[PDB]
Amino acid sequence: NPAFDMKQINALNGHYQTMIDNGDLQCASYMMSRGGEVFAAESLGEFTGGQKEKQTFQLDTIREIGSLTKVFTAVAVMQLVEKGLLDLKMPVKLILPAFDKPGFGEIKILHLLTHTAGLSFELDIQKAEGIDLTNEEEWINYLVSTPLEYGVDEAWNYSRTGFVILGIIISKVTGVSYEQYVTKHIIEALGLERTYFYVPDTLKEEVCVISEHECVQLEKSHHPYFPNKATSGLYSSLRDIWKLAEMFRNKGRLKDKKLLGRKTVEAMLRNQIKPGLPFYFFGAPREEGGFGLGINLWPAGDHYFMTEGTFSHLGMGWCGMFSDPAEDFTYVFFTPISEFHPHAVLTPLNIVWAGIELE
Template sequence: MGKLDVHFLSLIENGSIQSASYLIARNGKVAAWKSMGKLDGTADRGDLQPDSIRKLASITKTFTTVALMKLVEDGKLYLDQPVCTIIEELNNPTHQDITLYHLLTHTSGILPVGGYFNEPYPNPWWGTNGMEDWIRKVLQGPLYYRPGEAYNYSSAGFLLLGEIIQRVSGVPFESFVIENIIEPLQLDRTFFDVPESLHGQVCVVDQWDVNLLKPQEDYAKLPPRSDSGLYSTLHDMWKFGQMLLNGGAWNSERILGRRTVELMTRRHLFGKPAYQWGGKLQDKPHALGFDIAADHMTSFETQGTFQLEGAGRSALFVDPTEQMVVVFFVPSVSSWVPLSVLGTKQIIWSSLM
């Protein structure tokens, strides 16, 4: 049994995580693909499988970034474009300087994700009347920082990016992603709405997860699901990551141009502070829609690896130097189990020969 399996089994046995699955690919070929632990934290439905479906949470943002960059490639948007030229609610002295670039790099200064500042009782931004008038709700109050001043992780910013995509493309955000990314890549087990016939193959940890599988009554009244709405599998996520590693192409399908991928996956933030869940960083590295590994004494990933985690329970890493794609799911009732992510990265990258 390999070191990685022992690591995951230890976390499962001590109750830190419910289960684990991982896929590691190098040079375009899958080298390891395995799972262990329970599929369901609410009922006995057997074991997690290598092709089980799992909610991606914030990894959805990588699809949103690719979708937006397709519109940039088509000449319909530009990265320094003020958001207020598309969404009228931002046409005011507080928000008029926010650009698409600021939203993609989490430097807009608008509402951060709940709990970002380790506040003990984060409030949902939607308040009364649900999601009605959601754009004005996420813009209420002052900016946390001036645009471009600091990294301020904002799912609300990616909701605005989804709104921009659907206004500029003329189709719902979800339809644009399906037609331009999911279908061309043949991501057959990637969904915004998992078919009911496949609900039994979805990994869930609690009743909240179960409830999320139920379709909403009227998506037209809700924000686009551009921050955390996708479900997928390890294999589908590998194909997505491999497409980026290939410079925007998968087999005969080209999703993005090579120069677009280079722009999207290189470091853009230098010297920007970030508080982020208690960690007071003075220099937060970030690409466009991706975190990026920089030259740091505690980073095991190769410098230039672009990556994103989803709610501390899922992760995608693309390492151009090692020609490697790593995807893993570590479902847990805890929002963040450090060893399930940090320890996993250490084992994988330290084992490279």
């Protein structure tokens, strides 16, 4: 009825379990659905941050989603476009007057959402002495004192700072904090039950941590060097990231809950990058690839088994959200691991899509 070859579930479980058994990572979990109905989900392994004995990784374990936070930021921006409070062709300087200067004055909201604003990947916090980088105005002023790496619409260059700026813009036009906005209008609005910018004290013991850094950050109430958590920092769960992916696949709604109109989602899932633009990632050139309004359209097609049109975002940590509208199919996963490893993060997608059968 899901029309899925369950021998591929056995293969998927053994793949993750083998990496766990060999010490490549501590734990892994996944959730997969057809037509909005989860038919396979599993959690494997155990976790420890180093300070207590290993704990079983469960399907409802809370885990930081890293880069996947940017997808929440993208939805928030687009909700404000639906309200008429933002237009993607607005120059950033219209909202943040510090951008009213050469170079920065050409950046439009659309550029930030598509990683084409010319911003570098990161800001060097080591050179911000005497600046409180958790203060919005001090962070913006530091940002605009640092040279742009490219002009606008010259390159796709994945940028953390682009989405911090989007968080500030969200706060400025709504009159609440970025986190308050997303919590009300996306997290609560979609019925996400284990998703938090800051995990309640009573639930912190149910959070997967695999390193000293993660333990320390779980106890903090702010991001260490950004004024918001719009680029990274959300904690979530499989089911909640599954709901987010399904919301996109269903073009903006999940049963009775509606976050976006269908025409808005169609725009978000359409390639927005000028063809021929070079792609850079963390300094290195990357294969061209479609990119939507904060949503990745690669990997898809080509030698992958995911159908062209599959949309996704990976999250540092690592985790991932993949949804293939042509097969009514969604796969979300957590592979907590200290360093990206394609055998853990990407190769399992082959196993999964190879099990899809004709409905």
